[PDB]
């Protein structure tokens, strides 16, 4: 279905001027921030959804990421499919690769401790990552066939929970500046 969810989260640092645009469109102007995640998407994620997006502007300056971001409960797990970024070194436990939507992604797993989640301000949870091996071109219609990622993660025993929460094509960052404009459908 078309989008029905607006995510606008910041830890409070600097400027995160997030604009809830028409329909699935949004934009973000950010500068000297802390952590933040912003985007349009769906209230209930699905492992079978094909996410469409067009990033008309993608201009991160620092640690910023253009990524599908979502959650399950039962158990509580955060997941990320990163298509582009500014300056970022991907590091940590490495599980393999998945090919999807004309690209190849590296699979990582991490843990966050005493951090914000959909369940509270100080929670501990596993994170599943797909990170594109090269930055995806932007400005044209793009697809994330999320089922390919779910299935690849499953093949490494990285199972998602049964109670699906939000699923957003996000702009996220950490102590950085930039601008983005993304339409999601
Ligand atoms: K709006």
Author numbering: 1 to 185
Question: What's the publication's text?
Answer:
Fentanyl is a potent agonist of the μ-opioid receptor (MOR), with an affinity of approximately 1 nM and a potency 100-times that of morphine. Custom-designed ligand-binding proteins offer the possibility of both detecting and counteracting toxins such as fentanyl. Following the placement of the hydrated fentanyl into the binding pocket via PatchDock, RosettaDesign introduced 9 mutations to the Fen49 scaffold to optimize the protein–ligand interactions. Fen49 was designed to bind a solvated fentanyl.
From the SSM experiments, we identified a Fen49 Y88A point mutant, termed Fen49*, that proved to be more suitable for complex structure determination. The 1.79 Å Fen49*-apo structure again revealed a highly preorganized binding site, and an overall structure in close agreement with the Fen49 design (0.72 r.m.s.d. for Fen49* compared with the design model over 184 of 185 residues (TM_align score of 0.98)). In addition, a 3-residue polar network between Arg89, Asp106 and Tyr108 on the backside of the binding cavity is disrupted in Fen49*. As a consequence of the altered loop, tryptophans 63 and 90 adopt non-designed rotamers and collapse inwards towards the center of the binding cavity, with the designed Trp90-fentanyl stacking interaction replaced by a Trp63-fentanyl dipole-quadrupole. Unlike the parent Fen49, Fen49*-apo produced crystals with an empty binding cavity that proved to be useful for soaking experiments. Fentanyl appears to stabilize the binding site; Fen49*-apo Trp63 and the Thr87 – Thr93 loop exhibit higher than average B-factors when compared both with the Fen49*-apo structure overall and with the corresponding residues in the Fen49* complex. Despite the divergent Thr87 – Thr93 loop, the parent Fen49 and Fen49* have virtually identical affinities for fentanyl, suggesting that this loop, and more specifically the differential Trp63-90 interaction with fentanyl, do not substantially lower the free energy of fentanyl binding. Instead, preorganization of the inner binding cavity residues appears to be the main determinant for binding.
